[PDB]
Amino acid sequence: CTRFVYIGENNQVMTARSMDWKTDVGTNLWVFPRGMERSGEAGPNSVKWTSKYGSVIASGYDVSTTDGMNEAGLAANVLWLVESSYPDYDGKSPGLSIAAWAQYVLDNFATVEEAVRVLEKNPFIIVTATLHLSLSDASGDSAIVEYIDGKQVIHHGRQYQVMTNSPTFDEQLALNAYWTQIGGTVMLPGTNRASDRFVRASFYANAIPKSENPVEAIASVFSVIRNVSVPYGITTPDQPNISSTRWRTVIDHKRKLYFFESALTPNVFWIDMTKLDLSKETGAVKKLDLGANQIHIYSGMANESLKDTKPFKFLGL
Amino acid sequence: CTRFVYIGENNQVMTARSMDWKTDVGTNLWVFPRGMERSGEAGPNSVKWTSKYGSVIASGYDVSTTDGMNEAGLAANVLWLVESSYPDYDGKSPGLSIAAWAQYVLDNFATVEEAVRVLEKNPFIIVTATLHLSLSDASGDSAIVEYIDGKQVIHHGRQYQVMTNSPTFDEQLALNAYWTQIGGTVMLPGTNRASDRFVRASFYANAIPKSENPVEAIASVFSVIRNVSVPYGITTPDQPNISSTRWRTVIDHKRKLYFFESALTPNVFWIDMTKLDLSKETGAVKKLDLGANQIHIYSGMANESLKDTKPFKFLGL
Amino acid sequence: CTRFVYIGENNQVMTARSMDWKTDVGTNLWVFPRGMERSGEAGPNSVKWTSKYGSVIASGYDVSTTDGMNEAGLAANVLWLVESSYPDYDGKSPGLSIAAWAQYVLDNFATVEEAVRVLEKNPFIIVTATLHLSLSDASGDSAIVEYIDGKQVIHHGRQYQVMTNSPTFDEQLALNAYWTQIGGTVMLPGTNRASDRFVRASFYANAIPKSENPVEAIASVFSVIRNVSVPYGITTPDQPNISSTRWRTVIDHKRKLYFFESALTPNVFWIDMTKLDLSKETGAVKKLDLGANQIHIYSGMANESLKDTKPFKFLGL
């Protein structure tokens, strides 16, 4: 449910995200080394591929990839509670289960441009917790991919630094517009409305110092995504599009770090991709077991708590 | 710089606080068992006392107590950047260095009433960042103690659930007033102005579910104090009363837990007072060394990382 | 319902007011020269007095004085829909019907200080639209007189430039407080809530140029009181304290001009007190007949349309 990209000097680029949902999302982290053979779980005409890039990802119920980054610095965030209208699936085109959407992207491409160029070819038939896809890279580039009237719609440009789960993206830009005229040190909208979150993220992302110091940038980036999270247990059924923030992620594109934080358990740590073996030859599929509401606590660089496990099967046909 | 008390059912009371300051505050945690003999470090007429309650506290530069709780469930939060006018100190009356103010309170009293009743009768003159004192109890009671026109001024009542560092507390209630007419699901002020923070804290504190489940309450309480923290590195010298949030505390009054979180390092853990030896007979002074910007990471119940250390000397003379 | 004072250089002082009410107020203008003998219409112990200062006033139903000024430059605005608690009237003390309250003040005093000094010592008991009294003078001084818990309460000072007929005056200052921190060119509250009106009036009053040019000042002052009026026919029963603006008044203290404008009829004009005969020796009581909803249109200096009439009898027995 909320995402933004910060761009500092000397390629110090960072993508942060909050997950908002009404319930436990059953998230564990996974490491997938390169050269994995995969199917889109969309019946006999599922798309197939062999991963080119290793990733570290956050699962949706250990049956989907909902967040993550790859060793090339591409980040993917699948946002929940979106206004989608997905296409019908005949069965005759190559199909891709939406649960694997993010994984396909993370496995196959190094940049947002690479990904967008291929996405505009015709092999994006999604199958089908409603979902849209946000992407960012180490160069600071961004894109969002939506389904509106059964059609894939892509916005692509580094100026799209902030994205929310509701409403559609051309609408999000509209709701933000009023606040481009009002200075963010004088007034900001402070509710948990997606528009309000959007505006605060946009203001704070651009106000972060751009000077090279990763510890500082990280500090400022968390503090901002925390600001834009939805407090827990507070929202009422009167506002269906808002949900409590369950967890947060921060992706350090330069240094290849994936930070994770729980709202339900005091639990914050990160995975360092530079110490992972993502090779075909010896790299293992590994899982970090967080447990329900991330009760299993880790801290610092948590790589050593990763355990060899068989990769889960994506949800599909 | 921002503090609020949440009151749930069955004595599930929680006090949360953010520390806002322009720089490192050099904070480490300390455990002080009962029966410690102390001096107020205010020259020959320093007040003296022997602690009646063990505490766990957060230091200011290992030369002051700026935050903490005691085994009876009294909490003390010393807020920074306040509008004070402290009295002059003739050497003649019993004196108390302000660096030990919070400690004196935590050491001597079990409740906010107990503390207010004694402070009313003027047992000392405070001696002298600028600082004011916020207190809360396991019964949900609250008070704030300020110095205005060289005089100790106390507000005392459970209805005073939210306090900021600026301006004076009477003024804080005034700046909040406008927003009592506007529903918090429709609009909230979203900047880092103390008034804005105040208003969001009051709305969210009362919107938290009151149902008995500590893990849920804790989750909702952090998420709210995080919401009212000031994002890191963002504020400019144009607005002198606002400062980046350096860390947060959450005090669980019922279960006697002290949670601590850093903004500069991913570092979150808690101290469980029920597993500490706070006896005069066999209770040691212990310190948890967090290091500059809390670089030393802990997690979960961090009691075992506490180390026997000689207690620091409070600042003043 | 909305009043403000602008203070320019060289004693260019102006008081503006909007009248908000749910229905026709039946207002006509009257001229009362000096030396009129009057009774307070409060039974056998009614206060009695002989006017010292000629006035031009706006009636409430030709049975009360609800607005006006005197030849010395004292202005009185009786605001409607207030939170009053009026005293009981035994019958033993000198009494004054509230319908004549403003008239008594305008007739007897030249300044706000003069008036406050005499009203402090309680020369009468008010006898009972719910009503409170606002005053201003050619020196820029202001006061408001309210009844709270059956007691006369007076606020007196030049700094009280803005008053509403919403909540008690002490509460008005509180609701305004938040907006003293926010620059009025960046954000202002735009609804018809008394607090919102108050805040816009306080900002615009202090932003008007202070350079001596009456035509310009007048233009600015109307434009501001128009801003702060409540649009006609718009308010819903959900907000009982707000009412459509029926008319506006602007008092030029220096030049002794009383401007009047209708919201229900396009009708705007003024009375010039310097061309009226207010002497006891030859001055007549005169009325300008505006009619229901001010259907009788005048323009410019409307003095010539004033007609000799017997003064009305104030309500109350």
Place this chain on the structure above:
Amino acid sequence: CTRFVYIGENNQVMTARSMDWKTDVGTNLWVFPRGMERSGEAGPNSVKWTSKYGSVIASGYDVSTTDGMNEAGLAANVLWLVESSYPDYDGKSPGLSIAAWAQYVLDNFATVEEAVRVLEKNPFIIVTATLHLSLSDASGDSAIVEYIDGKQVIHHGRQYQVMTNSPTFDEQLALNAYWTQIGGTVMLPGTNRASDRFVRASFYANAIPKSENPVEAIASVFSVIRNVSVPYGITTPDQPNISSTRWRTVIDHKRKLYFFESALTPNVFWIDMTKLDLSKETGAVKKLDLGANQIHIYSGMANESLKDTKPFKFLGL
């Protein structure tokens, strides 16, 4: 600078407008009967036409038509300080001086649809205060015509009830968007920013009662256009797109009344088109001389103060 259309029952349609500018606009009112032969004052290839419909209009500096209505109920409001990029004028195509733009429209068409169908096919090139054109009808229809990237751009639909001078119209709808989520009785933006004015006008226009009672509707409509006017003398050079409101018009489409009000002089009146002779055979060109800052005061139906005058020459070459 601000315009809106109110639509009541039984064809009770009204267009109101504020004119905002930094200085005197030198406006007088004119009556032009039908059958006037006119040139576009754009050199040898000026467009020519013979008026079909009599109009009453407000001039720019007696050299342009900036506001008005015709006997069929078409209204035209030329807004000032717009973001235009006008086309180059060769000299080869039929040309129309922008000063006569509104007049051409009022003279030739009875409805907004009639006007849009002809303007779509480009009968002329506008020849060139920056100006854009707003139109409304007795049927409640609206359109706005702008020049963006040297191209005529038209928005046409009854939904476009509110228009400002800034920014371009597509951008105006965007800046309004945020406030479609917030109820106008709970919060409205209260500054003089065009967006703020836009939002308040859209809310109040739709909240006006739709009853058939012209005096009431008129009252509400003025009160609203007064609300969205920019107070006089208070804007600073820091905000270049905002200007003091100089005057207002209200057009009663059903009854064919043109109301005019000054901000600089207390002066309000109207022209009744049903009592004008607009025939070619006996109708005279007439002018109502308002004078600098509308110092010449009129009131009520001011028709009798109209004086036979030679029509002015539109600016051009």
